[PDB]
Amino acid sequence: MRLGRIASPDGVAFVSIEGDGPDAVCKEIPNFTGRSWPLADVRLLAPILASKVIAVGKNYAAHAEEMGGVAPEDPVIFLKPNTAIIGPNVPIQLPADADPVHHEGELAIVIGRPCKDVPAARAAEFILGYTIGNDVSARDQQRKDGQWMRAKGHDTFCPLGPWIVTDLDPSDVELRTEVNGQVRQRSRTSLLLHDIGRLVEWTSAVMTLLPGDVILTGTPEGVGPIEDGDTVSITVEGIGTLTNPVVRKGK
């Protein structure tokens, strides 16, 4: 199943998306009501209203073989404000002064139940599903501030979507980022330094996680700049593709 939010002519609905052909249907909601919008008629929004967004930075091994092996250091987690969230096909707006601003394609965990102190092995019990995220980052501000929050916290700097997949096996799916059709990031989640359960364990040991909260699981190598007029597309195997145009704000 794929869960998400859509903008209809009747308004906003939380829907179930079913079908891979453009004869695709969004059915409203789980108890279904009966109203059906084709996917063609409506527009996908960010699939959930997150109270907070937690992200990790360094979380991909370079290659499977190294290592392995020796335990990775503990995760470093941080927050992006939920005001940064935008959905598919919404422009990423670059600050006039921010150079360079980087794309960071990531697999996103969506929490489905309130939780605290969850053991890594039980993480799936509290996970609604998986979607795609982009941890857009003003790299200059990162270096100036030390704290990464401002750099990653601007409005539109957290694209999320296109929908939430509830039955995905996210253990070994391909993640890739394209800029204007050009592949710039490519890895598999089998190379996650801290896997999904470890991240949920680490994060819920720190703070209460609420239904809707998002945990971005990190980005592999290849992070690179995005400029006015670019299109960034992040594809996760078994989920789909999150696409956003890019515009720079005037001075």
C-beta of 147: minimal distance to a copy of itself in Å? Answer: 5
What secondary structure does DSSP assign to 193-209, as a single string? SS-HHHHHHHHHHHS-B
DSSP state of 121: G
Lookup: tokens for 35: 């109203």
Measured from each CB, the residue nearest to Na ion is 135
Taking CB under 8 A as the criterion, which residues in 199-228 touch a copy of itself? 206-208, 210
Question: Out of 77, 173, 193, 223, which residue is the one contacting a copy of itself (CB under 8 A)?
Answer: 77
Lookup: tokens for 218: 């990190």
Q: Which partner from the list Na ion, a copy of itself, none does 135 bind, CB cut-off 5 to 8 Å by kind? A: Na ion
Lookup: tokens for 229: 């007029």
Q: Categorise residue 132: left if φ over 0, alpha if ψ from -120 to 50, beta otherwise.
A: beta
C-beta of 49: minimal distance to a copy of itself in Å? Answer: 11
Taking CB under 8 A as the criterion, which residues in 80-99 touch a copy of itself? 80-84
Question: Out of 20, 23, 66, 74, which residue is the one contacting a copy of itself (CB under 8 A)?
Answer: 74
C-beta of 108: minimal distance to a copy of itself in Å? Answer: 17
Q: Where do contacts with Na ion occur on this chain (CB under 5 A)?
A: 55, 104, 124, 127, 135, 219
C-beta of 136: minimal distance to a copy of itself in Å? Answer: 13
Strand partners, 249: none
Per-residue binder mask for a copy of itself (CB under 8 A), 19-58, x = binder: --------------------------------xx----x-
Q: Alpha helix locations (H) across the chain?
A: 139-145, 149-152, 196-206
Nearer to a copy of itself by C-beta: 154 or 198? Answer: 154
Question: Out of 147, 171, 182, 190, which residue is the one contacting a copy of itself (CB under 8 A)?
Answer: 147
User: Where are the strands (E) in the chain, listed by range?
Assistant: 2-8, 11-18, 25-28, 36-38, 43-44, 53-56, 77-80, 85-86, 92-94, 101-103, 105-111, 127-134, 137-138, 158-165, 174-179, 182-188, 214-216, 224-225, 231-236, 240-248
Strand partners, 176: 186, 235
- Cα–Cα distance, 120 to 183 (Å, whole number): 33
Give which of 58, 220, 78, 99 is closest to 158, Cα–Cα.
78
Question: Out of 2, 5, 103, 154, which residue is the one contacting a copy of itself (CB under 8 A)?
Answer: 154
Give which of 8, 48, 49 is closest to 26, Cα–Cα.
8
C-beta of 34: minimal distance to a copy of itself in Å? Answer: 33
Q: Is residue 247 part of the contact set for a copy of itself (CB under 8 A)? A: no
C-beta of 104: minimal distance to Na ion in Å? Answer: 5
Binding site for a copy of itself (CB under 8 A): 51-52, 57, 74, 76-84, 116, 144-150, 153-155, 206-208, 210
